[PDB]
Homo-oligomer: A and B are copies of this chain.
Amino acid sequence: GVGVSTGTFNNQTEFQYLGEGLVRITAHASRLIHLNMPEHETYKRIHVLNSESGVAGQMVQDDAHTQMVTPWSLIDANAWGVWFNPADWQLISNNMTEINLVSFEQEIFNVVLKTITESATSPPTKIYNNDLTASLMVALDTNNTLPYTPAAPRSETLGFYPWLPTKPTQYRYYLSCIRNLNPPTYTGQSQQITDSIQTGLHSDIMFYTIENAVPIHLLRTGDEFSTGIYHFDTKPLKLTHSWQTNRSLGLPPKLLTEPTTEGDQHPGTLPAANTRKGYHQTINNSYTEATAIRPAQVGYNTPYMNFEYSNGGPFLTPIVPTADTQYNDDEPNGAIRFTMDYQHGHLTTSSQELERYTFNPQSKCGRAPKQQFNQQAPLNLENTNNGTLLPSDPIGGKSNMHFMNTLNTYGPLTALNNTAPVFPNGQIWDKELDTDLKPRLHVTAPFVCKNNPPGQLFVKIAPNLTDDFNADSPQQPRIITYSNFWWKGTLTFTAKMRSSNMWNPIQQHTTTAENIGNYIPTNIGGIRMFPEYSQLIPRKLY
**Which chain B residues lie closer than 8 Å to A132 at the CB level?**
none
Contact of A335 with B71 in the complex, beta carbons under 8 Å: no
Contact of A235 with B290 in the complex, beta carbons under 8 Å: no
Known: A204-B243, A232-B104. A258 touches B8 (CB 8 A): no
Contact of B186 with A383 in the complex, beta carbons under 8 Å: yes
Q: Mark A2-44, 1 if CB is under 8 A from B, else 0.
A: 1111011111110111111111111111111111111011111
* Chain A 374-424 residues near chain B, CB threshold 8 A: 374-403, 405-418, 421-424
Instruction: Say if the beta carbon of A138 comes within 8 Å of chain B.
Output: no
**Which chain B residues lie closer than 8 Å to A143 at the CB level?**
none
* Chain A 440-489 residues near chain B, CB threshold 8 A: 440-451, 454-467, 469-476, 478-489
Contact of A365 with B310 in the complex, beta carbons under 8 Å: yes
Expressed in whole angstroms, the minimum distance between the Cβ of A6 and any Cβ of chain B is 9
**Which chain B residues lie closer than 8 Å to A119 at the CB level?**
none
Nearest CB in chain B to that of A184: its residue: B373
Contact of A516 with B220 in the complex, beta carbons under 8 Å: no
Contact of A33 with B241 in the complex, beta carbons under 8 Å: no
Nearest CB in chain B to that of A28: its residue: B490
Nearest CB in chain B to that of A192: its residue: B54
**Which chain B residues lie closer than 8 Å to A300 at the CB level?**
308
Contact of B102 with A268 in the complex, beta carbons under 8 Å: no
Contact of A523 with B9 in the complex, beta carbons under 8 Å: no
Contact of A40 with B258 in the complex, beta carbons under 8 Å: yes
* Chain A 30-82 residues near chain B, CB threshold 8 A: 30-38, 40-50, 53-82
Contact of B107 with A320 in the complex, beta carbons under 8 Å: no
Q: Name, among A175, A258, A409, the residue most crowded by chain B CB atoms within 10 Å (CB to CB).
A: A175
Instruction: Say if the beta carbon of A326 comes within 8 Å of chain B.
Output: yes
**Which chain B residues lie closer than 8 Å to A124 at the CB level?**
none
**Which chain B residues lie closer than 8 Å to A390 at the CB level?**
184, 186, 398
Q: Mark A107-131, 1 if CB is under 8 A from B, else 0.
A: 1101000101000000000101000
**Which chain B residues lie closer than 8 Å to A195 at the CB level?**
49, 53-54, 64
**Which chain B residues lie closer than 8 Å to A46 at the CB level?**
255, 258-259, 267-268, 523
Contact of B209 with A522 in the complex, beta carbons under 8 Å: no
**Which chain B residues lie closer than 8 Å to A68 at the CB level?**
172-175, 207-208, 521
- Tally of chain A residues near chain B (CB < 8 A): 452
Known: A11-B212, A160-B81, A162-B212. A395 touches B399 (CB 8 A): no
**Which chain B residues lie closer than 8 Å to A2 at the CB level?**
220, 222
Instruction: Say if the beta carbon of A198 comes within 8 Å of chain B.
Output: yes
Contact of A158 with B31 in the complex, beta carbons under 8 Å: yes
Contact of B487 with A31 in the complex, beta carbons under 8 Å: yes
Instruction: Say if the beta carbon of A145 comes within 8 Å of chain B.
Output: no
Contact of A212 with B367 in the complex, beta carbons under 8 Å: no
Instruction: Say if the beta carbon of A233 comes within 8 Å of chain B.
Output: yes
Known: A9-B218, A187-B56, A326-B178. A313 touches B64 (CB 8 A): yes
Q: Give 18 A-B pairs besides A59-B290, A72-B458, A342-B471 with Cβ atoms closer than 8 angstroms.
A: A12-B213, A31-B159, A35-B461, A46-B255, A60-B380, A67-B252, A69-B172, A98-B237, A105-B230, A163-B211, A165-B471, A281-B316, A297-B318, A342-B472, A384-B400, A389-B405, A412-B414, A413-B443
- A-B CB contact pairs (8 Å), 22 listed: A22-B494, A26-B493, A27-B493, A32-B487, A34-B470, A45-B207, A62-B313, A66-B200, A74-B169, A75-B487, A106-B489, A160-B345, A161-B343, A177-B313, A182-B370, A232-B454, A238-B436, A247-B314, A280-B337, A386-B398, A394-B396, A467-B482
- A-B residue pairs, 5 tightest by C-beta: A81-B424, A42-B525, A247-B312, A57-B187, A81-B160
